[PDB]
Amino acid sequence: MDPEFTNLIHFQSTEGKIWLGEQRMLLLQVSAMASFRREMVNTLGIERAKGFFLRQGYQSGLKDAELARKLRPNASEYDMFLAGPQLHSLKGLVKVRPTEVDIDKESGRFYAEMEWIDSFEVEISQTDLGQMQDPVCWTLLGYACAYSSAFMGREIIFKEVSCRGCGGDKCRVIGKPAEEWDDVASFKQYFKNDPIIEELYELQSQLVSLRTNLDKQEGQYYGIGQTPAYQTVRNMMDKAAQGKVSVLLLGETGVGKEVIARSVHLRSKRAAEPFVAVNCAAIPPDLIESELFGVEKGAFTGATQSRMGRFERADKGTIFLDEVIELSPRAQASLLRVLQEGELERVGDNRTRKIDVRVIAATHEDLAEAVKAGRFRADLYYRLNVFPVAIPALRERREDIPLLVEHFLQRFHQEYGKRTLGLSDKALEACLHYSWPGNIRELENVIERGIILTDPNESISVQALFPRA
Amino acid sequence: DPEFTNLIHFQSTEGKIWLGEQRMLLLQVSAMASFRREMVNTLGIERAKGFFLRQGYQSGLKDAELARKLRPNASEYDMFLAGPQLHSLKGLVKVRPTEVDIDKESGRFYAEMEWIDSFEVEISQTDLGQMQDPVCWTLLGYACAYSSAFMGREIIFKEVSCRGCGGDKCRVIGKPAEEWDDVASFKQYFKNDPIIEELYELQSQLVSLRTNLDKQEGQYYGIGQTPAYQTVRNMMDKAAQGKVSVLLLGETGVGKEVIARSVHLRSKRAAEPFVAVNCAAIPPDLIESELFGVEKGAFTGATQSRMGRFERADKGTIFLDEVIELSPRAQASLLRVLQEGELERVGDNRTRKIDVRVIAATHEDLAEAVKAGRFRADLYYRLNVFPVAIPALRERREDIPLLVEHFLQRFHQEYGKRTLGLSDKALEACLHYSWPGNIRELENVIERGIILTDPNESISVQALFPRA
Amino acid sequence: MDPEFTNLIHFQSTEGKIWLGEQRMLLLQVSAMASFRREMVNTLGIERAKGFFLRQGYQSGLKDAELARKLRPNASEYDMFLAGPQLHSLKGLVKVRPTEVDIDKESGRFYAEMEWIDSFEVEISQTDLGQMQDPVCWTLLGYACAYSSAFMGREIIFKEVSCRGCGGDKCRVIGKPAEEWDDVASFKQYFKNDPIIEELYELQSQLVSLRTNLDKQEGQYYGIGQTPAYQTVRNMMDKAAQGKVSVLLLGETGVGKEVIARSVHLRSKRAAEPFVAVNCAAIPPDLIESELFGVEKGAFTGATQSRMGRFERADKGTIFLDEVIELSPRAQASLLRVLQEGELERVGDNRTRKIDVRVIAATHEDLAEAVKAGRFRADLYYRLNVFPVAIPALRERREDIPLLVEHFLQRFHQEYGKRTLGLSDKALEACLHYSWPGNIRELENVIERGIILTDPNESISVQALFPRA
Amino acid sequence: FTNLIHFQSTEGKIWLGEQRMLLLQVSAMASFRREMVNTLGIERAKGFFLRQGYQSGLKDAELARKLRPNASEYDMFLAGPQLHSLKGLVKVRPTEVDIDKESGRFYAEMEWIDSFEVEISQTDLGQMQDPVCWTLLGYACAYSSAFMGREIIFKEVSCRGCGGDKCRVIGKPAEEWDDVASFKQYFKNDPIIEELYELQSQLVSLRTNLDKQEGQYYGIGQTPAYQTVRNMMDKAAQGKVSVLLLGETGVGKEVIARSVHLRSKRAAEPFVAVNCAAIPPDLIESELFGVEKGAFTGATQSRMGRFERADKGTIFLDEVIELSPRAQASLLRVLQEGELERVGDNRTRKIDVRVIAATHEDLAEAVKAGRFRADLYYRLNVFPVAIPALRERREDIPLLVEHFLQRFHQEYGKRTLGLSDKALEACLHYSWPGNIRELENVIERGIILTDPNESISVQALFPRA
Ligand SMILES: [Zn+2]
Ligand SMILES: [Zn+2]
Ligand SMILES: [Zn+2]
Ligand SMILES: [Zn+2]
């Protein structure tokens, strides 16, 4: 009580501004706040809106504590502390009736009990009422906690032992230091920010990525740039797409030649046509020939039913052949006939079948001396060497490594949350200085190990990948 | 200002501030800045924008009623200008109306105004980056509200430029909503959808989508204690206590494999491996090599030795669907495993004992299959010790609703979040059906009924088994 | 042992022929037969070799029974039946010891117990150091069953009760007519000659079809024959796909607009670039804008970490927008800016970045009258209506119904069932007389239900689909 | 010679020197080849009969060398074709012969009259536009190679089964031929049964992996630590006591709780696991106990909690320390009185839920900081169960890794047949901060980095060393 601050609330109406000391002020309507709190509780629940108003009262109380300290710096301990309730009476929030006070800034002692008459929160509560079985003066309590804590330096927690919105006779509150309370953990959880919008964004992102994981075979790599070698590889595949040339993918294991062939097929004039990939190592050669070219029924090797070969399955399209060196010699002769005249014969069949099939082979072994050993035909090598396309390893793309890895982090982050919000410059330096035999598979694997292995820290360990053992 | 400066009566001793007949309060601008900051940080920008817009709109309605009750007639322009004069009086903004055209009787309205020293831009200063959209929200709401209450028509302003976006001046234009082209963007702010319900809904969707991951037991037959389901349940639970092999006689598509899984879970060996085997797989020489393995050597064409499926069920349980489709050597080896607890891999001389419970199943009548020599009598009598007949849905008339209800909840979450309706005519049509396919056909028709349902709250009667 | 047996094996050394009665014969080494059986068992199954040798012995026994009948023509029942095993002894295969016999060709009664001394099959078992777990005298048993059956006129079946190759003391066999046996199926299974090469081709085809799921599906039911309505839609789709013009797909639910947009992207110049489809049925408020255009972190919005929008995911590529009418007005404005100026900015983002994204919107509701009442902006409507493409309901393409279902049937023939491709024309005539309110999705669903309701019947039953209530 | 094929019919045997012989019918061989081609094709049966004739020819070459040790250089080679004529296979007419054992030179051309293979071909006919005398050709090649010591290859330049007038064959050393790769490919064993077993195994594993996994981490024995942990979980399984799993990150506590649930008396009842760290606490409270509709907390529709979803069953709670204090009080009420209330609801609901909490942080001092309730800690610490790290189970490590390698070998269908004991020593000598999880990860990376039949390198895992 005892205001004596109306002389400092000077204001100039002509400019549309209100002042108090050096601080700007605003005059808001109470009915608007009533509808505001009504819709707030309707769209946020009660516990969440209570915590939000509590945090806002705490922030307003810290600001008013700074203001009161700027107003009368050398008043007195009690005279400075009373400015809080005096600010409540001045701003029209509540009328304060402190029935008991005990304060000593040096010893840390604190205790108070006060009555809040004509609280604006109980007045708006008459507009939005229902069960109202818990105290409603939330911003008042948060402002009280903030002002008392800023004045004492200790954590002070108030509790409205009685409130008019609960059917009680008078709003009465008690304030003691937090150490002298029984259960403060619930109150401290009331003070947490709990940003629901970020939780909603994370849930929507995880839900979209989890529902899109079906048919998730389009985004891969080979589409980032930033190194001259990749630019050469992409413009070279652009040149190969427009032409009818059979393409040979020279590279190393784990560089992703199959997705490269898929991109070359999509960039070609026959992108809508089927694309069939065949890993020659997966199929034993005795089955390799019959799978690549099919087989017709009959007494000659004839099974019960004719089966179309993979080349006819890719008619008007493209055939990819990984590890083409591992072909049976008769299959190599059939491939040479298909490549030079566009004709094939099913196994056990004498009649010919026309085809129009683009060919993209790939291999890691040095085919030039492989022909010298008799392991591969010379003519088929001559027909396949028309358009070599070298795909560099990451060791040839050292400066390109970081963009991939952070992208990989996102690819794992939504699967497991934004764990490891760091890069560990030592780990990045170790990644720049490594041969990487599995240039993209080993990278994805070690990044998976780094994501799973860094649970009790927000920064990736340098030992999580390339452990010293 | 004649003479509104005297309208702000306040008594400090009473702890109240008054304006006309309306109680009011005076807050700091920095506190409102932190208020808007935490508000936008907790909800979306549009949610907070709608909140502040509705707050300004309610304040404008109340202030229009107050100005109407203060000076009764006077003049039209003075009564309309009392709104912006109230804005200047409360410390919100300074108003500079550069153009006005008002006629309350005819309904004509147009106005262009400048908002100088808006407090909302002072709150925008706490956010170092410029906002991409105008920030004077409660100002716009109070403007539209006061203008609409003063005219009797709905009047809508729009901040064509704002200083919080980097503009030179806060400039607003106000004309009646019917004279606008696109008004829906303003009306979207008035819709108040509870964000917490969307959080619970998204968490429920993600939890339901990740709960469909790798669980083994969730299929059907809940606590619907129908006499037939209860008899079959007590039969399986009494069967689980022993090691006796159990034969599941029933109909195709009833899901005998999960029944065997439940029998294994109710058994004493639930922690031990449970392996199901469909005999529809080709049974030439591969059925024997897969069921009992094969050892490497020159005595058989095996480069690598391969463990059989029965050894994978060691100390556990093996399910055998369509047991009639076994080769006679496989029937003999199964009889040896069932009567002596021993087996030997193909091409292997040494023998190893095993402890494997057996759950066979078949749709064909096994008695007449043993007749004509298609199946050995020994294995038949060893497997028929504890038959468990699974009734068709035709005799399960009372279990049909509970099932479909669970299936509804099971499939409404499947990429659709749709209706829970049943349409009693469709339900009576469903209870009166032979169901040649028991559970598979019912789940298929339930999905087909889900196909032709818009998020209208009712499954169509004609969506199931249409006239043609 | 008989006057006619010795010296009956006429043979000419210089002429290169060996004869026995009227039958040509061959003399092979035992070690060669041992390596023969070794290669046979090492390449095929134990049962495959068992059935081959048993059938070979059966044919030899049938021919030798006819030979013994024509050699001594007068009956002497026991003498001819014992001449059978005596013929076994003459060829050097086995020594026979009939310990019990009971024969009456007229009454059909038969029983015999015999011992096989020095069987060559056990000597071949000696080359396989591991003892067989089952009796090894296969061709002997087949010759026995064949000779006894031809001599009696009834089917006679022997079984080796004990064998020296399985570790037994003596080779002991019992022969009685098949009707007098208890379990005969295990022996009868050896007469079935199922080609192993067909099983190899079938297993390779199944494994390849299951391993081809790693590749993205080549497409869906978009490719059908040149039906005039489908052909008009096809040529319109091709001329629209060549350009960057945004395409609006007006149609009905279940018509499959997404596969249409995917085919448009594959036929476009940006097929290698990402294609992202977005259904607006997902919850809209503030989430539709943040997902379509992203959001940047900062104090201006409740974003802890920035999230890329789906339009940025479609950079240089194509985005599909199903139910575009269900866009928030802010989303419609941002989409209009992206479509008219090629630029967008993330929510809460200060800097603007341009994008190059083709747009394919689609809707079942009529956009006309939707712009009325304000549900959709006129600017975006006129910008999207430049190239409408109406997709007819299946009622106008009933001539396409068989082509679809046939492709669907074989597509479902691989679905864990290896079931049927039949149609039953009455069911097709019942299908043509139906509105199909759900066009293609409902037809695929009823086809799956019919596959569930039909086992070996090849034509799906006419009554299997849509039975009466 | 015919004088050496003496035999005694009384014992049922035919002899030639010290080698036993047998007399087989030709009609049986005709049906044999018919069924062989019907179930194997033509090229496969051709290679089979070729190598079988090769084996018979090598055996007959050893026999002929045993018959006349001092046979002349010409007569010893001629013993082959006369053995062909003696056994009834073919009549031989050598039109040219040239042999020199020392220099390795060889050449011959001969006629095969009345071949039995063309005779059976007359019964089983069709295309047969390629030479049919397969076993004869293999026997000739084997005998000439065994006699010379060099690779000698014959080829039937003409055959009566191809419509030709006479069967004519030529034998030359393999180096002097143009295309020998086809014949050498004909000589390969080609075990089709092994390919069938491999395809069936890969197909069965590929069809069962789509049916979802159950668990794997448990069941690896032969170490004291695992045996103590398993007997502890066995003793804990029969009771209803709430269990606290104290361990380390990545030790696989969830599968341990699932095995304890299956070993318990409520194995048929539902089992629900919840990782508290994955769910933000603001959602943790509403998710563990549900929420009721009303003006309170929002909620357009009531939502069941995970505890009611696990009624009559068991709930696992990883990282129980990260619970909101009101959720901790509700969990203590559920634990000591078996009752719960949905958020925003006043009425109580009975439940019967077994509880297994787990944590990696030191729970004892976490209560001292005010981060966790004391009463709930006393109620959860009733039965602590420590799960050791792999460093305490080093002797068990190789068994795990071999099972791991097998589960990954089948992951790609055909992979390295080695472990490299040096790499095993490196695995035993590592802290493994991520037990079983880091082991699976390093093994997958090492397997992807190796592709031959060679042992996996120690640098494939723990590189840069
Ligand atoms: Zn109160
Ligand atoms: Zn402004
Ligand atoms: Zn025997
Ligand atoms: Zn010939």
Numbering used by the authors:
A (entry chain D), C (entry chain A): 13 to 481
B (entry chain C): 14 to 481
D (entry chain B): 17 to 481
Q: What text comes from the article?
A:
The bacterial enhancer binding (bEBP) subgroup of AAA+ proteins couple ATPase hydrolysis to initiation of transcription by σ54-RNA polymerase (σ54-RNAP). DmpR (di-methyl phenol regulator) from Pseudomonas putida KCTC 1452 (also known as CapR) is a single-component bEBP that serves as a sensor of phenolic compounds. As is typical of bEBPs, DmpR consists of three domains: (1) a sensory domain consisting of a vinyl-4-reductase (V4R) scaffold that functions in binding of an aromatic effector molecule, (2) a conserved central AAA+ ATPase domain bearing the bEBP-specific GAFTGA motif that is involved in coupling ATP hydrolysis to the restructuring of σ54-RNAP, and (3) a DNA binding domain that interacts with the palindromic upstream activating sites (UASs) situated ~100–200 bp upstream from the σ54 promoter. DmpR share high sequence homology with other aromatic-responsive bEBPs, such as XylR, TouR, PoxR and MopR, and this subgroup are known to transition from inactive dimers to active oligomers upon the binding of an aromatic effector compound as a prerequisite for their capacity to direct σ54-dependent transcription.
Based on a solubility profile analysis and preliminary tests, we designed a truncated DmpR derivative (aa 18–481) that is soluble and produced at sufficient levels in E. coli. This truncated protein, DmpRΔD, has an N-terminal 6 × His tag that replaces the first 15 residues, lacks the DNA binding domain, and carries serine substitutions of two cysteine residues (C119S/C137S) that were anticipated to be located at the protein surface. The determined crystal structure of DmpRΔD shows a phenol molecule bound to the sensory domain of each protomer. The DmpRΔD-phenol complex is a dimer-of-dimers with overall dimensions of 150 × 75 × 70 Å. The two protomers (P1 and P2) form an elongated intertwined P1/P2 dimer through extensive interactions between the related sensory domains and parallel coiled-coil B-linkers in a head-to-head orientation with a buried surface area of 2895 Å2. The two dimers—P1/P2 and P3/P4—form the tetramer, which has an antiparallel head-to-tail assembly that places the four ATPase domains at the central core of the complex. The P1/P2 sensory domain dimer packs against the ATPase domains in the P3/P4 dimer in such a way that the Val53 and Ile58 residues in the P1 sensory domain interact with Phe312 in the GAFTGA motif (aa 310–315) in the P3 ATPase domain. The phenol is located in an enclosed cavity (24–36 Å3 in volume) formed by an antiparallel hairpin motif. A strictly conserved Trp128 residue is located between the phenol-binding site and the zinc-binding site, while the zinc is coordinated by residues Cys151, Glu172, Cys177 and Cys185. Interestingly, the electron density of the phenol group is strong in the P1 protomer, whereas it is weak in the P2 protomer.
